[PDB]
Design a protein around this ligand. Structure first.
Ligand SMILES: O=C(O)c1cc2sccc2s1
Ligand SMILES: O=C(O)c1cc2sccc2s1
Ligand SMILES: O=C(O)c1cc2sccc2s1
Ligand SMILES: [Cl-]
Ligand SMILES: [Mn+2]
Ligand SMILES: [Zn+2]
Ligand SMILES: [Zn+2]
Length: 454
């Protein structure tokens, strides 16, 4: 009645041995965790990274948030120090409940959150911090620079130090040379009571991993990848405004929605309270949302394993159908790795090779189709040198790399090979096929991968 908490997600407690390699571990828990979308990981008892900072010298610009179920919010992007924010956040919670903060039960804050967001008369607003690491506000994990203590040095090269995990060698997003700050760098989050993250999935359906450095807990709701489209159908019925087309990536619309509503429509949902010193991991295409119990400080980063590669291709296809902008070119990343085949991890080499083979067969079919439409002239083009906004399909907005069509009639415009009819009204013999590689260039790149993989 009123609120029925979803069942608890899986909780893992790896030994020091299991813990040592994060990628091996994540692959091991995958058959369990991917059925629930999110999972929690408790590090071995003596893994404690040192947290140290001056609460007076760390500044950030707060974001303001209204708390209404089904109301549209925009996804990403006055002044507080960490101390002045903390004083504001503690007083807020203390005055809301007329209690000391540590006596307010987590079960009660959860019940109250879902009451207040549904009640139109209540108009509670809260503030929070969200930003990538910078000079004015940096990682909560140790990084190189300032002389470090021996304990800080222990954690400098940990796999679970979230600065490192993007650039390790069983991850596939490391060798991307393209500028993608939002996606390879950690984000820092300063929470207060009821500050909330709306329902979403990660860019390119990647994994995410979140560490709560300190403070009061963070409450999570998660949905497994296989149920993503069920959730979206429910969302579309109850709030169609969120689904209208949008001019860019800085304009994505998201919302708060009671998990009991999803469960009523037969969408599986799980929950957890993440406490200080614990990790939460989200899997590819797993919807998630939540809210903070009180003043706290968290750090999170996207990442991509060899398991993810085929889904990454399927995601870019889904973006095309939806006319959604890409953060990077998937084919470009694949060819960049093929070109470094001799220094690749051998399991990586093997998995990249399979995706490359599919890429090449799809590209063969597409070029044959546009040839039969009467496009004859062609010229090689180094797509990776063009700014992203100069190589998007006019129609579906996909980031071009393997090929595109141009016409002298519309200087600078491109369509991908799926949308040859959408460029202009000139006859196809006036068009030109721009391509990065010939078929004959591509098969040897693939062979280097096979040899490295053996
Ligand atoms: O974990 C949090 O406190 C937040 C995650 C996100 S994503 C956008 C704003 C926020 S706040
Ligand atoms: O290719 C697939 O179907 C999947 C790859 C991965 S990696 C995590 C969950 C899943 S499901
Ligand atoms: O010139 C052609 O017909 C092709 C070139 C390339 S590159 C990948 C597939 C194909 S098919
Ligand atoms: Cl409200
Ligand atoms: Mn997320
Ligand atoms: Zn297109
Ligand atoms: Zn034209």
């Amino acid at each position: 009645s009123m609120f029925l908490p979803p069942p608890e997600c899986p909780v893992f407690e790896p030994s020091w041995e299991e813990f040592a390699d994060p990628f091996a571990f994540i692959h091991k828990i995958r058959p369990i965790a991917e059925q629930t979308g999110i999972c929690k990981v408790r590090p071995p008892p003596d893994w404690q990274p040192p947290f140290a900072c001056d609460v007076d010298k760390l500044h950030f610009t707060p974001r303001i948030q209204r708390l209404n179920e089904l109301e549209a919010q925009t996804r990403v992007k006055r002044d507080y120090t960490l101390r002045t924010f903390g004083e504001m956040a503690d007083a807020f919670k203390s005055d809301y409940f007329n209690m000391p903060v540590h006596m307010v039960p987590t079960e009660l804050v959860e019940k109250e959150f879902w009451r207040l967001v549904s009640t139109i008369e209540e108009d509670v607003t809260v503030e929070y911090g969200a930003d990538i690491a910078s000079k004015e506000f940096g990682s909560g994990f140790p990084v190189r620079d300032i002389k470090l203590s021996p304990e800080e040095e222990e954690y400098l090269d940990s796999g679970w130090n979230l600065n490192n995990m993007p650039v390790m060698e069983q991850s596939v997003l490391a060798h991307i040379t393209a500028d993608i700050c939002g996606m390879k760098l950690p984000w820092l989050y300063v929470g207060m009571c009821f500050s909330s993250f709306c329902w979403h999935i990660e860019d390119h359906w990647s994994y995410s991993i979140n560490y709560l450095h300190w403070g009061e807990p963070k409450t999570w709701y998660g949905v497994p990848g296989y149920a993503a489209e069920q959730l979206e159908n429910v969302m579309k019925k109850l709030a169609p405004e969120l689904f209208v087309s949008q001019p860019d990536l800085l304009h994505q619309l998201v919302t708060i929605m009671n998990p009991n509503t999803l469960m009523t429509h037969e969408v599986p949902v799980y929950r957890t309270n993440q406490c200080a010193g614990e990790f939460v991991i989200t899997f590819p295409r797993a919807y998630h949302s939540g809210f903070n119990q009180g003043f706290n400080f968290a750090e999170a980063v996207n990442f991509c394993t060899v398991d993810w590669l085929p889904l990454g291709r399927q995601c870019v296809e889904h973006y095309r159908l939806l006319h959604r902008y890409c953060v990077f070119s998937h084919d470009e990343m694949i060819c960049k790795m093929a070109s470094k085949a001799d220094v690749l991890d051998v399991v990586v080499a093997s998995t990249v090779q399979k995706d490359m083979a599919i890429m090449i067969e799809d590209e063969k079919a597409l070029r044959e189709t546009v040839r039969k439409l009467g496009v004859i002239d062609s010229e090689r083009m180094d797509f990776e040198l063009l700014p992203d906004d100069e190589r998007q399909c006019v129609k579906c907005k996909t980031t071009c790399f393997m090929s595109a069509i141009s016409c002298s009639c519309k200087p600078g415009l491109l369509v991908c090979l799926h949308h040859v009819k959408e460029l202009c009204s000139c006859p196809p013999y006036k068009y030109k096929l721009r391509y990065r590689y010939t078929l004959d260039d591509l098969y040897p790149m693939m062979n280097a991968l096979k040899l490295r993989a053996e």
